[PDB]
Write a protein that binds this ligand. Structure first.
Ligand SMILES: [Zn+2]
Length: 224
């Protein structure tokens, strides 16, 4: 399929978005409604994810988290805003998006000329620190700069699943926005949290991994 939505554990689902370069995002089906983690690539891909969601639950999509300011994590925002979902980010992600959206859209289109020239659509719910959703069951946090200066992790304590965002994945990638030296220091800050983790969802390549994905990528970036 162009996109799949598949349960990993309980209310926690993984989105495989095979449009453009494959990106993986997440969905949490809660009591009051649905939280989307990563907006997906475009308003069209977001509509496709919403179609999959409505085959699972009739509850509202409450909010979507932009886990960084990039096109693969924020490109769907126009759609999510249009259906009345909140678009949620840290203040840092929001500020970088205002200043740098046009640059990341241009960068995206160098590699993917087919990708649309999307207008800026900023988050409307902005957090100055770490934050939670779903009665504390979706837990977003900053552990430092890595793939971008602002990228966050999201943790699901009940299911022991960590969303790795663009930060954790199988292949190095080309590192154009990364802070190569801070990257492993960020991953070691994350490990020092000692979060119970059964599953890491890589944000690119095949999503389903163990906690060793952290180590895998750490080893790669340290040889970069
Ligand atoms: Zn990415």
């Amino acid at each position: 399929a162009g996109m799949s939505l598949t349960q990993v554990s309980g209310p926690v689902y993984v989105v495989e978005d095979n449009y453009y370069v494959q990106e993986n995002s997440m969905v949490y089906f809660g009591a009051k409604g649905v939280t989307v983690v990563g907006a997906t690539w475009t308003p069209d891909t977001a509509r496709e994810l919403h179609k999959l969601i409505k085959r699972v639950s009739r509850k509202p999509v409450l909010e979507v988290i932009n886990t960084n300011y990039h096109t693969d994590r924020a490109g769907g925002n126009a759609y999510w805003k249009s259906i009345g979902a909140k678009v949620v980010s840290t203040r840092q992600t929001r500020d970088l998006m205002k200043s740098d959206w046009a640059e990341i859209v241009a960068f995206t289109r160098k590699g993917l000329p087919e990708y649309p020239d999307l207008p800026l659509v900023l988050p409307n719910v902005v957090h100055d620190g770490d934050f939670t959703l779903q009665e504390g069951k979706v837990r977003a946090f900053y552990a430092g700069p890595a793939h971008t200066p602002d990228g966050i992790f999201v943790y699901f304590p009940d299911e022991q699943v960590l969303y790795g965002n663009c930060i954790l994945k199988e292949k190095l990638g080309n590192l154009s926005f990364a802070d190569v030296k801070a990257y492993p220091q960020t991953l070691e800050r994350l490990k020092a949290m000692k979060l119970p983790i059964k599953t890491v969802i890589g944000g690119h390549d095949s999503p389903l991994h163990g906690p060793e994905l952290i180590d895998h990528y750490e080893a790669l970036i340290k040889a970069a």
